[PDB]
Write an enzyme that holds these catalytic residues in place. Sequence first.
Site, mmCIF file in Angstrom:
data_model
loop_
_atom_site.group_PDB
_atom_site.id
_atom_site.type_symbol
_atom_site.label_atom_id
_atom_site.label_comp_id
_atom_site.label_asym_id
_atom_site.label_seq_id
_atom_site.Cartn_x
_atom_site.Cartn_y
_atom_site.Cartn_z
ATOM 1 N N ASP A 92 49.452 -68.110 -18.217
ATOM 2 C CA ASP A 92 49.989 -69.205 -19.024
ATOM 3 C C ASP A 92 48.874 -69.798 -19.882
ATOM 4 O OD1 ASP A 92 51.912 -71.190 -19.859
ATOM 5 O OD2 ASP A 92 52.014 -72.091 -17.841
ATOM 6 N N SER A 93 49.270 -70.632 -20.838
ATOM 7 C CA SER A 93 48.335 -71.556 -21.478
ATOM 8 C C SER A 93 48.140 -72.784 -20.593
ATOM 9 C CB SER A 93 48.828 -71.921 -22.877
ATOM 10 O OG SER A 93 50.118 -72.469 -22.838
ATOM 11 N N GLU A 149 30.109 -69.376 -37.588
ATOM 12 C CA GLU A 149 30.819 -70.638 -37.646
ATOM 13 C C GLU A 149 30.859 -71.217 -39.051
ATOM 14 O OE1 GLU A 149 28.081 -70.032 -35.648
ATOM 15 O OE2 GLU A 149 28.729 -70.440 -33.568
ATOM 16 N N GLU A 190 34.503 -69.531 -34.484
ATOM 17 C CA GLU A 190 33.933 -69.732 -33.164
ATOM 18 C C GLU A 190 34.281 -68.621 -32.194
ATOM 19 O OE1 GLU A 190 31.794 -71.665 -32.158
ATOM 20 O OE2 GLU A 190 32.010 -73.755 -32.814
ATOM 21 N N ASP A 223 56.442 -81.359 -32.120
ATOM 22 C CA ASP A 223 55.012 -81.433 -31.768
ATOM 23 C C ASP A 223 54.191 -80.542 -32.703
ATOM 24 O OD1 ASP A 223 52.646 -82.068 -30.542
ATOM 25 O OD2 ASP A 223 53.047 -80.887 -28.703
ATOM 26 N N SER A 233 46.134 -76.668 -26.026
ATOM 27 C CA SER A 233 47.090 -77.372 -26.867
ATOM 28 C C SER A 233 46.713 -77.296 -28.328
ATOM 29 C CB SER A 233 47.110 -78.846 -26.496
ATOM 30 O OG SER A 233 47.767 -79.046 -25.286
ATOM 31 N N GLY A 234 47.739 -77.101 -29.153
ATOM 32 C CA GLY A 234 47.556 -77.019 -30.586
ATOM 33 C C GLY A 234 47.258 -75.629 -31.105
ATOM 34 N N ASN A 279 31.765 -68.493 -28.656
ATOM 35 C CA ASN A 279 31.231 -69.441 -27.694
ATOM 36 C C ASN A 279 31.120 -70.816 -28.362
ATOM 37 O OD1 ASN A 279 29.506 -70.987 -25.976
ATOM 38 N ND2 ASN A 279 28.884 -69.083 -24.979
ATOM 39 N N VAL A 283 27.413 -72.441 -28.278
ATOM 40 C CA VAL A 283 26.270 -71.712 -28.811
ATOM 41 C C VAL A 283 26.544 -71.433 -30.277
ATOM 42 C CG1 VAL A 283 24.827 -69.646 -28.642
ATOM 43 C CG2 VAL A 283 25.822 -70.648 -26.585
ATOM 44 N N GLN A 323 45.587 -76.818 -20.051
ATOM 45 C CA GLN A 323 44.876 -77.950 -20.650
ATOM 46 C C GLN A 323 43.753 -77.453 -21.547
ATOM 47 O OE1 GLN A 323 43.635 -78.669 -16.739
ATOM 48 N NE2 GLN A 323 45.818 -78.459 -16.243
ATOM 49 N N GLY A 324 43.697 -77.976 -22.776
ATOM 50 C CA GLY A 324 42.674 -77.583 -23.720
ATOM 51 C C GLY A 324 43.079 -76.465 -24.668
ATOM 52 N N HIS A 377 50.435 -83.862 -30.633
ATOM 53 C CA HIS A 377 49.849 -84.567 -29.506
ATOM 54 C C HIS A 377 48.320 -84.431 -29.469
ATOM 55 C CE1 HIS A 377 50.023 -80.878 -26.856
ATOM 56 N NE2 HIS A 377 48.952 -81.473 -26.356
HETATM 57 CA CA LIG Z 1 29.697 -71.075 -31.550
#
Ligand SMILES: [Ca+2]
Length: 223
Positions: free
Chosen positions: A171-172, A62, A52, A84, A177-178, A54, A57, A174-175, A40
């Site tokens: 809980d987990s 990264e 990652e 899914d 996901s995956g 932050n 920043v 929105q955002g 999804h």
């Molecule tokens: Ca960063």
Amino acid sequence: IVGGYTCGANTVPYQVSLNSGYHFCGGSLINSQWVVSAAHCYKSGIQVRLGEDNINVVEGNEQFISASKSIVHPSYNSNTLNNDIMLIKLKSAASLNSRVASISLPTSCASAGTQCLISGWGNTKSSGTSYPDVLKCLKAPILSDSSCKSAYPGQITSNMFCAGYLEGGKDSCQGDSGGPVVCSGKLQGIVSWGSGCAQKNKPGVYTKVCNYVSWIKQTIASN
Ligand SMILES: [Ca+2]
């Protein structure tokens, strides 16, 4: 993640952020050139962001690598969220180190009661909205099939499990996901769905990764 804690920078080295101008989903690095996420979360124009903490920043660990291919599961149903899961191939291999590392796929499925680590950059509020800049973590147990099905009558397939707390508060969201659900050092779940976040009797629902290991391995072997 609602009711969690700040993980600490680069302490979840397999966690990736999927970026299309902004963070929109999590994922898990499973080898130097492949990421697992939720179907999804599919879209075009994905840049995978590894290393990652932050997400707003540049902190120095990264690696930003474009996707070359996305493969949604053959049987994904966007109405029921059955199957899914998707795979994302990176245009180049990530450089693996202590802060950017793959997570093992499970040899065996996990059982209710097993503790897991769920992580992401999703909303930290169950009412209202606050998105963190740094990675959040939650320790949560897998719930029994029977309690998952009782929480979501008519909705839980053999490719799903619940994890979290029936009392609510953790809980987990929105955002997230995956992103990963890791138990004893193996990727057992993918953040998939739930009714709201952190509500009583509505635990998170996760894709049951152990069902997909054969498909993952054979897809990687030919792509
Ligand atoms: Ca960063």
